[PDB]
Structure formats: C-alpha cells, structure tokens
Write a protein that binds this ligand. Structure first.
Ligand SMILES: CC(C)CCC[C@@H](C)[C@H]1CC[C@H]2[C@@H]3CC=C4C[C@@H](OC(=O)CCC(=O)O)CC[C@]4(C)[C@H]3CC[C@]12C
Ligand SMILES: CC(C)CCC[C@@H](C)[C@H]1CC[C@H]2[C@@H]3CC=C4C[C@@H](OC(=O)CCC(=O)O)CC[C@]4(C)[C@H]3CC[C@]12C
Ligand SMILES: CC(C)CCC[C@@H](C)[C@H]1CC[C@H]2[C@@H]3CC=C4C[C@@H](OC(=O)CCC(=O)O)CC[C@]4(C)[C@H]3CC[C@]12C
Ligand SMILES: CC(C)CCC[C@@H](C)[C@H]1CC[C@H]2[C@@H]3CC=C4C[C@@H](OC(=O)CCC(=O)O)CC[C@]4(C)[C@H]3CC[C@]12C
Ligand SMILES: CC(C)CCC[C@@H](C)[C@H]1CC[C@H]2[C@@H]3CC=C4C[C@@H](OC(=O)CCC(=O)O)CC[C@]4(C)[C@H]3CC[C@]12C
Ligand SMILES: CC(C)CCC[C@@H](C)[C@H]1CC[C@H]2[C@@H]3CC=C4C[C@@H](OC(=O)CCC(=O)O)CC[C@]4(C)[C@H]3CC[C@]12C
Ligand SMILES: CC(C)CCC[C@@H](C)[C@H]1CC[C@H]2[C@@H]3CC=C4C[C@@H](OC(=O)CCC(=O)O)CC[C@]4(C)[C@H]3CC[C@]12C
Ligand SMILES: CC(C)CCC[C@@H](C)[C@H]1CC[C@H]2[C@@H]3CC=C4C[C@@H](OC(=O)CCC(=O)O)CC[C@]4(C)[C@H]3CC[C@]12C
Ligand SMILES: N#C/C(=C\c1cn(-c2ccccc2)c2ccccc12)C(=O)O
Ligand SMILES: N#C/C(=C\c1cn(-c2ccccc2)c2ccccc12)C(=O)O
Lengths: 703, 703
C-alpha cells in the first residue's frame, strides 16, 4: 500500500533541508583545453580512427573469412560492373565512365571506411542527380558533331563529383556528421518512392529507343513524359520486346529467389545470366543491322588521365553538389547502420563522411561520377557472405579486369537490357506506396510528411524537393505543439491524484482553487494560445478586474475629496443617498494608470473588492483566490514565453490571487533565474514540488 | 503535513475503480455539419463581422469623441502627406503616387477594418520591398527619354500591389490569419533592425544627390554603398548641408519632445514646421538655379484613371508579392495588437487580412503602392487622441485636399529634406541593436535567431532573408530538443520524492532498480540519443546480453545432444571435466536467430543466467531487474520514437527485466493505442501513475 508521511515542501524549503552537492559545471575555456591537450595516447587514438584499416586488417581471421570474402567479392563485382554500365546511362555519358565510378571509391573506402558490409559505388538516385546537375551546368556555361557534346558532359560530371567530395570531406573534418538525424523515416520513405518514380520514367527513352532532350529543374518528369509519349510512334519494337522479355524473366526469377531461400544457397544470378544470354544472342544474330538496336559502344581498354576540375562548373552547381553530398551521406549511413546493428560493431559517421568524400574526389579526378552505397548491391554482398571490406577489393578487382582486359565483350549489349535490369529492381522502393494507409491510421502528422515529400520531390526535382521536404518536416513539429489540449484538473478519491475534470465522475475541487495544465513546451508559437486558454479556464481576465478596481478606487478617492465618504476604521459612511451616475473617461497618455497595482494605504479600512461597494459601484467579483499551474510537461520556455508568463503572473498577483507553479525540475528554475524573471512581485516562493503540496499549503494558509 | 494513504495504482487498476464519463469526441462529418448549418442568427453574426462599421458607427459617442477624432485626424493627415511623399522616393516613382498610397487603403479600412487606432498607409520597409520587386520585374520583361522608364515602374508598382492585395484577401477568406505566430519577437527585432539599415542606406542617394542604378536581390545594400561612395566627389553640397541641418534640428526637437511630455500637450510637429521652413526658403531664394538642388516636381492636380494589372508582372513577381503580403500583415497585426491590449477591444486577424487586401487592391488599381500601418504614424494618431477610425477619414480628407487643391505648394520642396525626415525617425528601430547583449545573457537561442535574421536580411535582401530566417527559427526548436539532459533519479528522505542522482547527498536507490528520465518530447531527431543515454545509464546493452545468452543456450543444447550434459530436475551433471574451447561461428542468413526470445521449456531445470554456467561459459551478468522510465515531460512521440521505444522495451523484456513507463496522462496512452504498440509482449500493464507507485509495486512483487 502507498503510505507517505512527510512535510509540505516548496522547492526552497526542500533545498534548506537537503544539502546539494554543488556541482561546478563546465565553461568554455576548459572546453578549449580538453581539445588542445595532446597526448601520446590521444594522438594514436586519433590516427587509428583516421586509418581504420590499421586496426581491422591485422585482426583478420584468415581461416574463417577468406573464402567467404572471395565468393562475396566475385558475386558483388559482377553486379557492380552491370550496375555501373546501367547507371552511366542516367547521367548520359559513355558507359565506360560508369565502371570508373565503381572502382575508385571502393578502393579508397577500403583504407578509410568504417563499415564492413556496404558496397561502394553508383546508385540510381545519385546518378540521376548528377545527370540533372550536368544538364544544368552545360545550360549555363558561357560560349567561346555529337562527340563533342558528350565531352562537355563528362567534364561537368567530373567537376560536380569533385565538388561533392570536397563538401563531404569538409563536413567530415568539421565533425558535423550528425545531420542524418534531421531526416525522418517518413521523409526518407516519401523521397525514395518519388525517386523510384523518377528512375522509372528516366528508363523509358532507352526501352523505346527515343531521343529526349535533357530537361532541367522545375518539372523534369512531366517534360520527359511528354517528350517520350509524343514520339511513341517511332518506337523500336525490337528493343521493346527484348526489354519486356528480360524484365518479365528477371521479376519472375527474383520472386522465385526469395520465395525459396531455405533450399537455395548463394542465390541465382539471374541478371548476369540474362546479360550473358542477351549479349550472346545480340551477337551472332547481328541485332545491330537487322534491326536498329542501339548498343553499348566500343569502350576503350584502359583508364584515362586525370583532369583539372573547372571552376566555372564549381560556380554554377553549388546547391546541386550540396544536395548530392547530403543525399549520398544519408543513403550510405542508413544502409550501413542496418549491418552495424546486425553484426554489433561501431559506426563513425564523421569517418564515413571523410571516406566518402575522399573516394568521390579521387573518382571525379579520374573521370567518374558520384559514389555512395546502394542497398541492393550491399544486400548482395552481405547475403553471399561478406565479412570485411576485402570483398569490396575483390569486387574492384573484377571491375578492373573488365576495364583493362574484357571490354571487347559487352559491346553487343543492347542498352535496353540494362534499362530492363534497372527497372526489375525498383520493386522494393515502389512497394513503399503501401505506407500512406499505415501512417494515416497511425499518426496523420507523418502521413502528411510522406505525402508532401512525395509531391515536393515529384513537382520540384530531386534536389529542391528534398530541401522543401526538410523545411516542411520542421514545420510539423510546430504543428504538433501549436494548439495543445490544455486541461483543468481536479482531485479523485481524496488523495494526491489529480486528473482531468471532464474525465471521471466524482471529482472534487477545493473552493477558490483552479489547477491548470498545459501539456506542451511553451514557446513563441504557443504563448497566446496558452493565455487564451488560461483566461477562459479561470472564467475572467485579470486585466479587466484590475482596471475596473482602479476605476472604482479613483471614483472613491474623488468622492473623498468632496467629503462625501468620511472614512472610519471600518466602513464608508456615505452621507448622500444617491449621486446621479457621473462616470469619467480618461484621456490617452493617461489610461495606463489603470494598470498599476493598487496600494490603498491611505485608507484605514480594508477594501474588500468582493462584498459590495457603496453608491452603486459594480466592480465584478471573482471567487478565485489561488491558481496552480502544472508545468510538468513544459520542457522549455524561450523569451516570448517568459515575457508572456511574467505578464500573466503579474496580472494575477495584482488582483490578490496567489499563483503556484508546480511540477518542474531544478534545471527549469535554474534557467528561469537567467531570464530576469524573479523580482519583488514574482518571487521564487511560488514554486512547489507537487500539486498536492500546493493544495495542502493553500488549505493550511487559509485556515 | 503531507499524509497520504491509498492503494498502489497501475493506470489500469485506476480505471477499474474510477468510472470514466466516456466522452464521445467529435468526428469530421459533424465538423462539416457545424459549418454548413446556417441560421438567421449566424448569418447576421457573419455579416456584422464582415462590415464592422455597421457595429461601431451607430454606437458613436458624439460628445466625447468627435473633437478628439478631428484633432487627431488633422495631426495624422499632415504626417501622412509628408510620409507618402517621402516613401514614394524609395520606390523611385513620381512623388504624387505616394499620396494615392495614403488615401485609398485608409478609406477602405474605415469600412472593413477592426482596429480603432492604427493609421493605414505606406511604411518604409514595404516601400523598399515594392521598389525591389519593381526593379526585379522591369529587369525580366520581354522587349517589344526618362519619362518612359518611370511609366513602366508605376505600372509595375500597381501590378505588384494588386497581386499583394489579392494574396492578402485570399488568406483572409481562407481563415488562416493565425500565421503571425510563426514569427518570434527576436526574428521581428533582427529583421526590423536590418531593414532600418537598408532604409538608412537607401536615403543616401537623395542626400548626396547621386544617380544610383536600381540594383536587385542578392546583395543590394553593398552594391548601393559601392555606387554611392564611388561617386562621392559629385556630391551636391547644398542638399547635404540642408539635409544635415534638417536632420540635426529634427533629432534635437524629437529628443526634447519626449523628454518633456508632462508639460507639453499635443506634441510639437517639428517635421511639418521644418518642411514649411525648407520649402519657404527654397522658394524665394530660388534653390533650383543658384544651386542644382533636385526638387519635388510639378505634381498634376487630380487622380488618375484606373489601369488593368499586367499578368506578365503577375507572373514575374509571385514570391515578391508573397513576401510583401506577409510582411504587411505581420507589421499591421503587431502594431494593432498593442492598442487592442491597451484599450481592451477584440481584434479579428482574418478581418484585418480582408480589409488590408481590399485596400491594397483598390490602391493598386488607381495607381498607388502597397499599404499597411506604420508604428510611427499610428503612434501620432493615438498620442493626439484618436478614438475611432474617423481620425483616419479626416487624415484621408487632408490627403485629398493636398492632391486636389494645394499641389502647387510642395513644389519647391528639396527632395533631401524628405530623406532627412525619414532618417530622423530611424532611432526606434536602430536602438534595437542593444538586444544582442540582453538575449545573449538570457537565452543564447534567441540571440542566435536575432543574429542570423540580421545577417540573412542584410546579405540576402528583405524578401529572401525573411524566408531564410523563418527556416532557421524552425531549426532552433530542433536545436533545443536535440541533446536533452537525460537523468538517473533516486529517492531522497525515504518518501515519494525522486530527483537527480548527482544533485543531493544521501540519495537511495533500491537494489536492482534504475529510474531514467528524459525531459523532452521524443521524436525523429531525438530517439538515437535517447537510446544511447539509456544504454549508458543502465550500464549495458540488452542486445549483447540477449545474443550471448542465445549463444550459450545453443552451446548447451549442442552439448546435450552429445550426452555431455544429462539434465536433472536441478543442475547440470557435466560428465566431462573440461572441453577444449570449441566456439562456433554462425553464417549470414542465420545470425538473426541470436535475437530471438529464449524459450527454455525443453529443460526442467530453470536456467539462472546470473550465478555460473558450466564448462566455462562466461555470459556476462547483470544486476538490473526493473527499469522505470519517467515519461512526465515527454509531450509527444511520432513514429520513429514508437518504433525505437518498442525495440528498446522488447530488448529489455527478453532478458527478464521488467519495464515501467511512469508519469503520463490518459491522452498519451490513448495515442499509443493507435500506434500498434501493445502486443503479447509489451502489455498495457507497464504503465503506472507515479514513480513511487512503480517502486512500491516492484518491492511488493519481489518479496
Ligand atoms: C504544393 C505546391 C507548393 C505546388 C507548387 C507547384 C509549382 C512549383 C509548379 C506547378 C506548375 C508548374 C509550372 C508548370 C509549367 C511550366 C512551363 C515550363 O515551360 C518550359 O519551359 C518547358 C520546357 C522547355 O521547353 O524548355 C516551365 C516550368 C513551368 C513554369 C512550371 C514551374 C513550376 C510550377 C509553377
Ligand atoms: C502530383 C500531381 C498530381 C501534382 C499536380 C501535377 C501538375 C503540376 C502537372 C500535371 C500535368 C503537368 C503538365 C503536363 C505536360 C506539360 C507539357 C510540357 O511541354 C513541354 O515540355 C514542351 C511543350 C512544347 O513543345 O511547347 C511542359 C510541362 C507541362 C505543361 C506539365 C506541367 C505540370 C503539370 C500541370
Ligand atoms: C564547410 C564546407 C561546406 C565548405 C565548402 C566550401 C566550398 C563550397 C567553396 C570554398 C572555396 C570556393 C571556391 C572559391 C573560388 C572560386 C573561383 C570562382 O571563379 C572565379 O573567381 C573566376 C573564374 C570564373 O568563375 O570564371 C568560382 C567559384 C569558386 C570555384 C568557389 C566555389 C565554392 C568553393 C569551392
Ligand atoms: C552553409 C555554410 C557551410 C556556408 C556555405 C557558404 C557557401 C554557400 C558560399 C561561400 C562562398 C560562396 C561563393 C563565393 C564566390 C562566388 C563567385 C561568384 O562569381 C561571380 O559572381 C561571377 C560573375 C557572375 O556570376 O556574373 C558566384 C558565387 C560564388 C560561387 C559563391 C557561391 C556561394 C558560396 C559557395
Ligand atoms: C551565412 C551564409 C548563408 C552566407 C551566404 C552568403 C552568400 C549567399 C553571398 C556572399 C557572397 C555573395 C556574392 C558576392 C558577390 C557577388 C557579385 C555580384 O556581381 C554583380 O552582378 C554585381 C551587380 C551588377 O553589376 O549587376 C552578384 C552577386 C554575388 C555573386 C554575391 C551572391 C551572394 C553571395 C554568394
Ligand atoms: C554582415 C557582413 C559582415 C557579412 C559579410 C559581408 C560580405 C558578404 C560583403 C562585404 C564586402 C562586400 C562586397 C563589397 C563591394 C562589392 C563591389 C560591388 O560592385 C558592384 O556593384 C559593381 C562593380 C563593377 O563596377 O564592376 C559588388 C558586390 C561586392 C563585391 C560586395 C559583395 C559582398 C561583400 C563581400
Ligand atoms: C491561396 C492564395 C495564395 C491563392 C493565390 C493565387 C494566385 C497567386 C494565382 C491564382 C491565379 C494565378 C494567375 C493565373 C493565370 C495567369 C496568367 C499567366 O499568363 C499567361 O498564361 C499568358 C500571359 C503571359 O504570361 O504572357 C501568368 C500568371 C497568371 C497571372 C497567374 C498568377 C498567379 C495567380 C494570380
Ligand atoms: C502555397 C499555396 C497557397 C499554393 C501556392 C501556389 C502558387 C505558388 C502557384 C499556383 C499557380 C502557379 C502559377 C501557374 C502558372 C504560371 C504561368 C507560368 O508561365 C510560363 O511558364 C510562361 C512561359 C515562360 O515563363 O517561359 C509561370 C509560372 C506560373 C506564374 C505559376 C507560378 C506559381 C503559382 C502562382
Ligand atoms: N544488387 C543487385 C542485383 C541486381 C540489380 C539491381 N539493380 C538496381 C536497379 C534500381 C535501383 C537499385 C538497384 C540493378 C541495375 C542494373 C543491373 C543489375 C541490377 C542482383 O544481382 O541481385
Ligand atoms: N509618424 C511620424 C512623424 C514623423 C515621421 C516619421 N517618419 C518615419 C521614417 C522612417 C521609419 C518610420 C517613420 C517620417 C518620414 C517622412 C516624413 C515624416 C516622418 C511625426 O510627425 O512625429
């Protein structure tokens, strides 16, 4: 049973009887002495965190991990080759520059990366963003043969990814890799669903084999849909039927694959099989002069010399590279967190930013495009038994073998087989459309974030819809705390339990006491609503009672100068039966003296303000004498709240109503001490521990 | 004294013994039957709120208010004439179009407005915004004598203000006039200080008499400063010395004016006096051919016929007109709220939006620019004794007399006297620079809002810095709740008071109980920090203990198949002294079975997990058996919080640690019922009333 016998405490009387420890909290100048104090332990702890390969490579279990890493590396390197060739088409550069995007960041991440299970390379949302930034950068260059219009796109892609890597590396150095908390899962879900719709639309010009101009920012998906479906009569039917056959086979076998996972080890590489079959039947049957199928061209065997990034492209694409860097880091951290939770090893977000930025810089210098991880390729690497990032090294070696030696193969590949392979794996992102119903019946504030993120991304493009979506998801936090359900409380069962007055049957309120509760932090978007709810909860406005009391006092003092009210020790004598109702109106520059506190020390008689005032002065009466504010769910105040609350409490104190703030911790009062809140009128003795403390104090101080 | 004797309640046992009232809360379809249910009382209540002049005009006290309204109307009409002429220069149109800006909204607001003390007209921040929007609109028009370049600016100004009035009227119709709560007072203070710096810079080309091109959006103030100070050798010294003399005299007399306010009724109109003296000495001495002073030209006597707004200017200036409408409504509501609080009458914000939008539409049709109220002119109207909006009618009649009849006067006015009069009244907005110190020592989150609003407005212009400032002040709410000071609580004095464990001396914790407190709402930017703080507060991670227990159970079950552990009713028999430490590593696709709940029903012996496990199996021990979460300051959860909290509680329950959530109201649990939160593992019986309830329940259920 609950049995408590203690004294009534008042948050000052609690601190006289219970000695505090007196903690000396930390300043700024010693925050700048814990950072600059270097040590031989601190330096080695830093340089083993900058080069994580110095810590996991000598701890390699080369009896339990090597064969699994080799098998997983081969199985992810084949997928990396095909995905690089397919994602180079979304940037509209020659396809061999896709392979450079799947080699250099995977080599840099082996040395500088902290995850063990992600596969580093291109992924289609980032490749679409890089393609849109290139189309925006070549449409803004100053002026000074379709081999030279793609030589500009390659240099623009290289410059965009060098700038994105520079931004990522700078944010990793500045230790602000915690920015991934500013994206909710509803925002990520809506953004990835709309990006899957963007990817699905962008692969239509390769299936139908049409020529679509490179549209730009505001509504890119509808311009591309119009330019595709206005030329639908020029559709090459061989590419269409080949893409449909490859798409049907890869979706059927990818359903069969995960439908039967207990019986099937190292799952079926149906995309490699269909690519081999399609390139082998396009060769031999000569699907380039019988029909007019566009193929992957003759890729040159070898790497290309490094280029210097153009500062004009740096100037024209600053916000595009900011969006590319943010989306790349957010996707990589979201994918790597799954496997770090699954296998229990720590992830360093700032080291992730440093490794991805260095990989993107080295990739863009040697003419590749932007890299992060993909969820699909990382799932392929982890599903086949990847243990460390040596599987990434074997995958990069497979990409290297394809670049240097076997590049005469993949030349009869039909360029719509790649689009069909990219369309066959949009299923996981398109199945997120069944989340509007769940979030609708769950929250309705995150369903709004989902729907507005989808709409903003669709009708504003992948770079600008993300910024608008982040701003709207910041608005929804204000929407949650805008009109809080403010309550009046009452006692149940004649004990220390106080709940909502409209919720149970036999509640009891002490006479003259009001207990008000705001279940929300009070800030600038909240304080006027709080004042309105408090005023209609107590039943009156204290400013009106104060002003009418001041008007009555001015009329009483005016009648005292005329000798009409001879003041006794008790009671006014009233040596007139009735005066003829002369009300006096004050001017402006003089009305604010009605808001001053009443000091009736010149009369020996104590004016009651509640019984009856002589000579027909109405002065409306109140029954309230004590007000309790339950500030237990109020997490913070800012400035506007402290001003408005100081005004409310000053207006309540001046009409002789005691106020009590109840339910706060010591940090709340310690922050209120900085706000110039307490003075000779609002004292610190209004704070109490619990509601029952204040109620017992009221009942003791009355009688 | 505090004496309580009650049973221990558990938020389900409280609702079996206290019958709820069962309120039927309101749906959507009856929200759409309270709006469409029309009545003869509802219709008259609506149409008396659309035309407020039908309610205050027959209640006019024409014995106490008429002379004061006449005097205040004359005193504000003279100021309205001079301010209209001065603010027409910030738009760079001829000055007579300033007077039309101070006539038509003041006439429309007399019929449709709810305030009684504001003066409607131009104010310099809005006139600078209209000038910037005109300069941006004439720099974007398609192509098809300095009399024709200002005929384009007049039509662009008219179109911009018609679109701003349309936006204001549409937002007043849609009942969303509560948007003024989205601007903190720190944002308004920083914005108005930077706008005062903009106004001070924009009046330099009229004092020095220079020719400055109409610069635009990104850094307008530095381009204007460069274009002024590169031509400083061409300064007309007569305009300079006249502006300095007028500025010195008006600042000295405006200090003298409010230094002595008790002795001085109806304060000194020093601006009217200096304008009369300057125009009378510029005439007669002929300050137009002796020197080369630019003067206010010959204004044509009369109004101008209405024009149709160009839809090209509507197309080019959508965001500019949105910013103009928002700033006009915010300034007007902030000024009108002061006098509504001072004189105790209700303000309707949506009717304010409707009246201002109609006034701006009618003003822009008849070739004026945008209108709202100014704080200075409203202070002049209220200080001289304005009672109703009939003072606005007398002011508009004074402006009408100046337009129709006396326009041959104000023709020798020196056009830098007006700039000096506008510079002499920037003191109130420039004295807000002494708020970085106050907000620095008070909050440091609103000082940041002030500084970033000032910087964004200065280096981005008045339209775009406001949007960036609103986005940053939405970011600061996330900054406040990002890393909450999470605590571990303990008991003081062997009663029902639980406070921070590091704060007092003789605290007591029950053995095996941890009380954790997060003093913040938990949302998407908050849940990973909450999980990290809970894990390092309890001293371990429950996933690691669960996985190591599952590994130990798999090794025990493997040794049972070999007959090495013959299970008794109690104790393992262990018919081997020591096996040679064969640890087994699981594959991927098989590791997640370490996260499954332990069901050791196949053994009759109860496995302890805390004493000793045979054959040297370590399985790290915990002393915790009960965890209490103090969710009293947690105002809301969203989706990510419910998922992360469900994960945390499921991981704690599976290692046989009872969890208790404590301190919530019934609305919190009612919202958690929608989230698919409770199941066969996480039940609703974990919720308790207070911390002492849960602690007494723990101590009763142990022994
Ligand atoms: C929920 C709210 C925030 C949605 C707001 C949507 C607007 C941002 C969209 C809807 C209509 C769009 C417009 C629809 C059509 C066009 C014509 C289009 O014309 C072209 O130049 C086509 C391509 C070419 O030929 O170059 C340019 C974009 C534009 C102005 C669009 C700009 C973006 C707009 C205004
Ligand atoms: C998520 C959806 C429901 C939000 C609302 C969608 C609208 C903003 C979309 C739907 C139809 C779209 C239009 C569909 C087709 C076109 C034609 C397109 O034309 C061209 O690109 C070139 C035309 C030419 O050759 O002149 C320009 C965009 C536009 C107007 C689109 C503008 C954006 C619109 C109005
Ligand atoms: C904390 C992180 C986000 C810092 C990242 C900083 C970069 C975004 C900045 C720093 C240096 C900047 C560069 C400094 C100088 C120039 C040269 C400038 O060009 C010229 O002055 C002449 C050449 C021309 O534009 O024709 C174009 C912008 C650019 C590349 C700037 C682009 C933006 C850069 C890379
Ligand atoms: C959010 C925090 C990390 C600060 C980020 C700052 C950047 C957004 C700023 C800092 C340096 C700026 C650059 C400084 C100099 C230039 C050169 C400037 O060049 C010109 O004006 C060339 C002539 C012309 O464009 O007509 C164009 C803007 C730019 C790229 C600026 C773009 C915006 C930058 C990258
Ligand atoms: C705290 C952070 C967010 C501040 C970010 C500041 C930037 C938004 C500013 C700083 C430097 C500015 C630039 C400084 C100089 C110029 C050259 C200026 O050149 C002109 O065209 C001058 C006028 C003309 O001759 O037409 C155009 C604006 C620009 C690019 C400015 C664009 C806006 C910039 C990038
Ligand atoms: C609140 C402050 C401390 C924030 C940082 C200020 C900078 C963003 C400012 C300070 C100096 C400014 C510059 C001062 C002078 C000029 C020259 C000005 O030149 C012209 O307008 C035309 C030049 C020509 O004739 O070619 C263009 C803007 C610019 C570069 C300004 C760009 C913005 C700058 C770098
Ligand atoms: C809830 C509130 C914010 C609604 C406010 C809506 C306005 C901002 C919209 C509604 C109608 C729109 C107009 C509808 C049609 C046109 C014609 C359009 O021009 C043309 O189609 C041809 C002429 C040309 O531009 O050359 C230019 C934009 C404009 C004026 C639009 C400007 C923006 C307007 C006024
Ligand atoms: C925030 C809530 C209240 C919604 C606000 C919606 C507006 C921001 C949208 C709705 C209608 C839109 C307009 C619809 C049509 C047009 C015509 C369109 O004309 C052209 O594209 C002409 C050709 C060219 O510019 O090259 C330009 C955008 C504009 C003004 C749009 C601008 C953005 C507007 C005003
Ligand atoms: N990963 C993996 C596999 C196949 C592919 C997945 N996408 C993809 C498509 C859209 C979004 C994200 C990923 C491919 C793209 C081209 C060629 C092959 C694939 C596998 O072998 O299972
Ligand atoms: N109001 C009032 C008075 C004088 C003026 C105040 N500004 C002003 C200037 C900047 C910002 C806001 C206001 C004027 C402008 C032109 C001509 C006269 C005035 C008064 O007569 O006291």
């Amino acid at each position: 049973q609950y049995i408590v016998a203690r004294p009534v405490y008042s948050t000052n009387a609690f601190e006289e009887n219970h000695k505090k420890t007196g903690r000396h909290h930390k300043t700024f100048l010693d925050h700048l002495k814990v950072c600059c104090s270097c040590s031989p332990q601190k330096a080695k702890r830093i340089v083993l965190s900058l080069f994580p390969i110095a810590s996991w490579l000598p701890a390699y279990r080369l009896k339990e991990w090597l064969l699994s890493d080799i098998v997983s590396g081969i199985s992810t390197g084949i997928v990396a080759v095909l995905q690089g060739l397919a994602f180079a088409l979304l940037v509209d550069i020659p396809p061999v520059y896709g392979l450079y995007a799947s080699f250099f960041p995977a080599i840099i991440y082996l040395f500088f990366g902290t995850s063990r299970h992600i596969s580093v390379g291109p992924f289609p949302i980032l490749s679409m963003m890089v393609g849109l930034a290139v189309s925006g950068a070549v449409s803004k260059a100053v002026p000074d043969s379709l081999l030279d219009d793609e030589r500009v796109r390659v240099a623009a892609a290289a410059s965009v990814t060098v700038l994105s890597g520079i931004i990522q590396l700078a944010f990793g150095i500045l230790r602000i890799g915690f920015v991934v908390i500013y994206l909710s899962e509803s925002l990520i879900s809506g953004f990835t669903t709309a990006a899957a719709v963007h990817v699905l639309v962008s692969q239509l010009k390769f299936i139908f084999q049409l020529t679509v101009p490179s549209h730009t920012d505001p509504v890119s998906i509808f311009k591309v849909l119009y330019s595709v479906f206005s030329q639908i009569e020029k559709t090459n039917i061989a590419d269409l039927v080949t893409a449909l056959i490859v798409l049907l086979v890869v979706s059927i076998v990818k359903e069969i694959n995960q439908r039967f996972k207990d019986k099937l080890p190292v799952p079926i590489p149906i995309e490699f099989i269909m690519t081999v079959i399609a390139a082998g039947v396009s060769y031999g049957c000569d699907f380039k002069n019988r029909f007019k199928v566009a193929v992957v061209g003759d890729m040159n065997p070898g790497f290309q010399p490094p280029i210097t990034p153009d500062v004009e492209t740096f100037q024209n694409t600053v916000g595009d590279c900011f969006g590319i860097a943010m989306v790349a880091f957010a996707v990589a951290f979201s994918v790597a967190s799954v496997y770090s939770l699954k296998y229990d090893y720590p992830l360093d977000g700032n080291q992730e930013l440093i490794a991805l930025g260095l990989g993107n810089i080295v990739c863009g210098v040697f003419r590749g495009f932007a890299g992060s991880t993909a969820l699909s390729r990382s799932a392929v690497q982890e599903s086949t038994g990847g243990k460390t990032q040596i599987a990434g090294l074997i995958g990069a070696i497979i990409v290297l073998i394809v670049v240097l030696a076997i590049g005469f193969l993949l030349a009869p590949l039909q360029k719509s087989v790649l689009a069909a392979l990219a369309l066959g794996n949009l299923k996981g992102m398109l199945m997120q459309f069944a989340e509007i119903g769940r979030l609708w019946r769950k929250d309705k504030y995150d369903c709004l974030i989902w729907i507005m993120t989808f709409i903003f991304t669709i009708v504003l493009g992948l770079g600008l819809g993300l910024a608008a979506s982040v701003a709207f998801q910041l608005l929804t936090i204000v929407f949650r705390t805008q009109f809080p359900k403010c309550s009046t409380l009452a006692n149940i069962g004649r004990t220390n339990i106080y709940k909502n007055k409209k919720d149970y049957y036999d509640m009891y309120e002490p006479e003259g006491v009001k207990i008000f509760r705001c279940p929300s932090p009070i800030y600038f978007a909240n304080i006027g609503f709080f004042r309105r709810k408090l005023i209609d909860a107590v039943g009156f406005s204290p400013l009106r009672i104060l002003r009418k009391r001041n008007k009555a006092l001015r009329k009483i003092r005016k009648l005292q100068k005329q000798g009409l009210l001879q003041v006794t020790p008790k009671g006014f004598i009233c040596t007139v039966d009735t005066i003829k109702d002369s009300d006096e109106e004050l001017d402006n520059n003089q009305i604010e003296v009605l808001d001053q506190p009443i000091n009736t020390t010149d009369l020996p008689f104590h004016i009651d303000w509640n019984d009856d005032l002589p000579l027909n002065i109405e002065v409306p009466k109140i029954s309230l004498h004590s007000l309790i504010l339950d500030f237990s769910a109020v997490s913070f105040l800012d400035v506007s709240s402290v001003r408005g609350l100081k005004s409310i409490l000053q207006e309540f104190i001046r009409i002789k109503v005691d106020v009590y703030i109840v339910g706060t911790d010591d940090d709340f009062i310690e922050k209120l001490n900085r706000y110039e809140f307490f003075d000779g009128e609002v004292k610190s003795s209004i704070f109490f521990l619990t509601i029952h403390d204040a109620v017992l104090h009221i009942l003791m101080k009355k009688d």
